Design a binder for this molecule. Structure first.
Ligand SMILES: O=C(Nc1ccc2ncccc2c1)c1ccccc1
Length: 185
């Protein structure tokens, strides 16, 4: 890819975070806390899962950002509609307003319905996410492997403004405490 020059400075939106998450002062890192984080409930917060949105909203143009996933066992990354469900249980699918990939139990999968197996030779430490709003495209790149393509969603029905989407995952195992980090441009 040659997508870096549509680089956008993403920050995390505290108000959207599940109440167990800890967002750094610079709003560029998020991790799972060991307890509910002494914040009020609000209608924006994801209730059931360790999810948070970026502050930025996109309705046009090309956008690119990078996320560090070093030492994590489980995570979801991508973009979602501003209008996605926040409360209760749901699946990650384009029908529900999500364009995502994830790591789960040593397999990488794209959040189609049903999910799609990914073929990655070099487990990634940093992921690039590219959105072309007008083209209807969301693409994922393996920064650890010279920017190699991971997956492309095409003909996307964004149906409204988009937000960067993050899930740090649970830490039942004790092996998934590490943060997601937005990488410098
Ligand atoms: O399994 C389901 N959703 C999720 C979503 C996010 C998760 N994040 C961390 C851990 C588990 C998660 C599970 C689901 C929900 C409804 C109907 C069918 C399936």
């Amino acid at each position: 890819h040659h997508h870096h020059h549509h680089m956008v400075h993403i920050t995390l939106d505290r108000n959207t975070a599940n109440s167990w998450l800890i967002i750094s002062k610079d709003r560029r890192q998020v991790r799972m806390g060991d307890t509910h984080q002494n914040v009020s409930d609000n209608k924006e917060r994801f209730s059931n899962y360790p999810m948070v949105l970026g502050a930025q909203r996109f309705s046009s143009g090309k956008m690119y950002w990078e996320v560090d996933v070093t030492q994590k066992e489980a995570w979801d990354l991508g973009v979602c509609r501003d209008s996605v469900q926040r409360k209760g249980q749901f699946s990650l699918s384009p029908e529900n307003g999500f364009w995502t990939i994830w790591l789960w139990q040593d397999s990488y999968e794209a959040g189609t319905s049903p999910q799609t197996t990914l073929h990655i030779q070099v487990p990634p430490c940093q992921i690039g996410i590219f959105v072309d709003y007008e083209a209807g495209v969301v693409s994922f790149y393996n920064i650890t492997d010279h920017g190699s393509l991971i997956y492309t969603f095409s003909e996307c029905v964004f149906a409204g403004p988009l937000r960067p989407f993050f899930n740090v995952g649970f830490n039942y195992s004790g092996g998934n405490a590490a943060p997601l980090k937005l990488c410098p441009l």
